[PDB]
Design a binder for this molecule. Structure first.
Ligand SMILES: Cc1cc2nc3c(=O)[nH]c(=O)nc-3n(C[C@H](O)[C@H](O)[C@H](O)COP(=O)(O)OP(=O)(O)OC[C@H]3O[C@@H](n4cnc5c(N)ncnc54)[C@H](O)[C@@H]3O)c2cc1C
Ligand SMILES: Cc1cc2nc3c(=O)[nH]c(=O)nc-3n(C[C@H](O)[C@H](O)[C@H](O)COP(=O)(O)OP(=O)(O)OC[C@H]3O[C@@H](n4cnc5c(N)ncnc54)[C@H](O)[C@@H]3O)c2cc1C
Lengths: 490, 490
């Protein structure tokens, strides 16, 4: 603990989000980032519903939306006529925010710094040891190698995670069989169809202004340096007729569908988040979404463990909750690849039937919820009998009515990163019962009718419901949940 | 017309069904069959809900069920845990009848003969000409070649249809890329897993008694003579470990997924039915079902045309109605092939999600209806405004209450192969209005509440609703439908 409470390995968007969260939880966070200067990415990032809702309860949503384009729908597996309908899901943010990942990275960096996280760029982690008392990290710095001692170390260091490998955590999954190229390059052609198309030999996504010039190319066919020539050639194989790509080249890269996940998100004092914990083909823009939400899930649990009121069991719920979520993201990207397989004989007809189905609200809601994260709910600390219908559900989008009729968004209340007891129906017995926890937990009265009904919601710092009360609920049950979740009464 | 009213080319199950129907319509039917003796097939035929319902209204269902096994469900695209649920569909025959096609062929032959159809075996059709007055067929018979003159010729002569080719009707579609082998052979192995399995290299379906001996093998990998050695080898490639197949061999055959459909089901005095009209991979046992229903659709329309009260327009509704149906069967078999593709990287995960979906009633009902034929309804002779919700729907499964409370299955009423006017709510105005059509159309009073509501149903000889009356319906509307469908009043 000598150097800092928590060392974050990697200053990508996920590490920076995690450091923000740790600071909001009142503990020290040191971010060791390998690069001296951020690289640049695909400039077409997407932040989906549940990520947007999460940013809102952190008070970050506004700056993320400054000068931002949004989308009110999304195609599924390259199917556009019957796309994902954001209106069928319960949310007050029915849109995807189109924010370039580099901007997301800059914003989170600014925030993390403003919150008192120390960021060190050009410090690469080369070694990692842990014992009962603490974690030591070996870093390549200014006078060469030095050691950092901390209570916990979190690897948010990407798919090629150093932390994961050195902690001895397995990364089971498949190897890539799909090869994709993506580039932002200029072109001498006009009225070029800005279409997403399947052909017999692959997938082509051309995005060029009708005048010609800088545009986005993505080509997919069923690591290493990419040239403007490779891109040009691949486009030809897939499209049939060659396309003239020329400089200036703003970006050239490759990626594949290797689908892997850390077997454990936690090993003693070491934990993983983001791509360090899971990799997959970037279909439907789900990767960073998952990672940012990994971080908000872990941040307050980790801060609570450091300060002494979070239990080991609590910290264990990080893996138990987030691992199933990423496992499903991996499966769905792989399934989408099957649906997009370039293949007129069988897959084209199969796509016809899927499209019909997407025209129905129930199935459409099914996939919308899957891609946008709105279907994420947790099953933590259940009885032991059955738990309340609201337990584990997301409450960050609820809006109460205050003493004088004015709205009270639960999102704005959670901005302090403290648990909330929402008293939806009176229940002064409950509010009184929570007082010995007043230092950790906030009590807030407000009228609201939810579905299914609830008289009270004990809400976690990440917007999910830890505990829900029915009329049958006794103050004693709440004291039990308060202890189990948030530690012993003062 | 000199030789017979209608010549049927081919004495497979579809030609024999059609000849039955033509006889029930009171016109002459001559069946020219190439083979001198029926060959043998896969002995695991399946007759699905809508075929079973059709057999019932023909009074054939009983003999088809004599000593017959039935199934109360079916897997979809090799998915068994969440199979097609027959209970979610509206029917009083929620089962598949497992009848070997050879038995179906024998029964229809017996029936066709008992009904006065002449069957000629070992007479192959070699030539076909038509003019305004009639159709001439050239046949290879006892004293060699002879000519048959008829008003209409129907090609029910299989996928390699002579009639289709000689009539100049195109057969657009795909060529086969999937190669399957199927055989009934004995084996020296015991406790052999009677499982349907996907592997990395194909699909294997083993069905052997735990003692060993005669069993069914199907192997699928993504024409010509098959040997016990070919079978044995293919099984090895797909399964990994070789399997000992030995004589006696009861059957050995191959098939593929060539997916083709006649562009026209009718060319003047020549029409097509069954495999002559459509071919596809035999996944989900839909081929003969479609063909038998093609025949019941055409039989009474064709008989009515010959006798003078069926219009050309009516006869045209054969193609208009049945062509869309087979087109969808082709698409769904091709789509199912995509779902079964042996492929762990993408298709396995995709199958997981489809399986979840099949666990929902709505989606399950969707596929059940597709495979069993229960979703078939027609859109014929519509306004011109909107048509009654019951128009085009299948009414063969309705059961009325008679004068004294006793049930009156609509299936038993249709057994005469005459149109029915069902008076569900009184409407003596309607019954009186139908009297000038009494020679073609039967009137039957009986109480029943249907959903959506209907006061009267004008029902076709194949069990589908030609016309439905609301309270607003006038006798004049019915006279109009009666004329358009069933010809001028007497
Ligand atoms: C083409 C493409 C498009 C995508 N589009 C989307 C999208 O639209 N929406 C979405 O949600 N996701 C998208 N993704 C996925 C998304 O980019 C990733 O999930 C995201 O980058 C994960 O962020 P991260 O911080 O976990 O890892 P990274 O961004 O990889 O950051 C890890 C950081 O750790 C540092 N590091 C590594 N090793 C060490 C070390 N030993 N010591 C110190 N530092 C180290 C690296 O320098 C890096 O800065 C896309 C991916 C691709 C390839
Ligand atoms: C392995 C397998 C399993 C199947 N399982 C099912 C199933 O479970 N359920 C289902 O509904 N379908 C199934 N099918 C499909 C089904 O068998 C066919 O759709 C069915 O045989 C079509 O019958 P048909 O009478 O139209 O054609 P056919 O059975 O091919 O009969 C055509 C007849 O025409 C004769 N003929 C051809 N040319 C001439 C000529 N020039 N002159 C005179 N006669 C001629 C032939 O001798 C033949 O008897 C399966 C198919 C296969 C391959």
């Amino acid at each position: 603990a000598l150097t800092t409470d928590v060392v974050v390995v990697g200053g990508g968007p996920v590490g920076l989000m995690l450091a923000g969260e740790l600071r909001a939880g009142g503990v020290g966070a040191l971010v060791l980032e390998k690069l001296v200067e951020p690289v640049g990415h695909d400039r077409a990032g997407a932040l989906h519903i549940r990520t947007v809702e999460t940013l809102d309860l952190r008070g970050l949503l506004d700056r993320f939306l400054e000068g931002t384009q949004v989308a009110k729908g999304l195609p599924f597996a390259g199917i556009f006529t019957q796309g994902l309908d954001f209106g069928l899901v319960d949310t007050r943010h029915p849109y995807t925010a189109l924010v370039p990942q580099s901007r997301t990275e800059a914003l989170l960096a600014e925030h993390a710094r403003e919150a008192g996280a120390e960021i060190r760029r050009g410090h690469e982690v080369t070694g990692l040891r842990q014992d009962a008392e603490a974690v030591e990290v070996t870093v390549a710095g200014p006078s060469g190698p030095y050691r950092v001692r901390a209570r916990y170390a979190v690897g948010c260091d990407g798919g090629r995670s150093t932390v994961r490998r050195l902690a001895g955590i397995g990364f089971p999954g498949t190897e890539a069989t799909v090869r994709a190229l993506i580039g932002y390059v200029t072109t001498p052609e006009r009225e070029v169809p800005r279409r997403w198309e399947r052909t017999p030999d692959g997938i082509l996504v051309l995005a060029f202004p009708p005048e010609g010039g800088l545009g986005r190319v993505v080509v997919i066919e069923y690591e290493g340096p990419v040239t403007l020539e490779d891109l040009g050639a691949a486009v030809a194989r897939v499209r049939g007729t060659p396309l003239t790509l020329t400089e200036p080249v703003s970006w050239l890269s490759r990626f594949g569908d290797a689908s892997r996940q850390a077997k454990r998100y936690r090993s003693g004092r070491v934990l993983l988040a983001g791509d360090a914990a899971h990799v997959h083909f970037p279909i439907g823009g789900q990767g960073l979404n998952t990672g940012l939400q990994d971080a908000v899930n872990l941040g307050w649990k980790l801060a609570a463990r450091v300060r002494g009121w979070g239990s080991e069991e609590l910290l264990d719920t990080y893996h138990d909750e987030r691992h199933p979520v990423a496992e499903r993201v991996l499966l769905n990207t792989r399934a989408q690849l099957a649906l997009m397989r370039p293949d007129e004989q069988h897959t084209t007809p199969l796509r016809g039937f899927v499209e019909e189905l997407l025209g129905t609200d129930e199935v459409n809601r099914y996939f919308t919820g899957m891609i946008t994260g709105t279907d994420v709910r947790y099953a933590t600390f259940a009885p032991a009998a059955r738990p309340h219908p609201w337990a584990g559900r997301f409450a960050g989008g609820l809006v109460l009515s205050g003493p004088s009729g004015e709205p009270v968004p639960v999102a704005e209340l959670l901005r302090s990163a403290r648990p909330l007891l929402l008293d939806l129906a009176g229940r002064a017995d409950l509010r009184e019962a929570t007082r010995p926890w007043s230092d950790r937990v906030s009590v807030v009265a407000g009228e609201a009718t939810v579905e299914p009904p609830a008289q009270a919601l004990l809400v976690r710092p990440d917007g999910y419901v830890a505990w829900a009360g029915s009329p049958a609920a006794t103050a004693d049950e709440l004291r039990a949940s308060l202890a189990r979740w948030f530690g012993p009464p003062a």
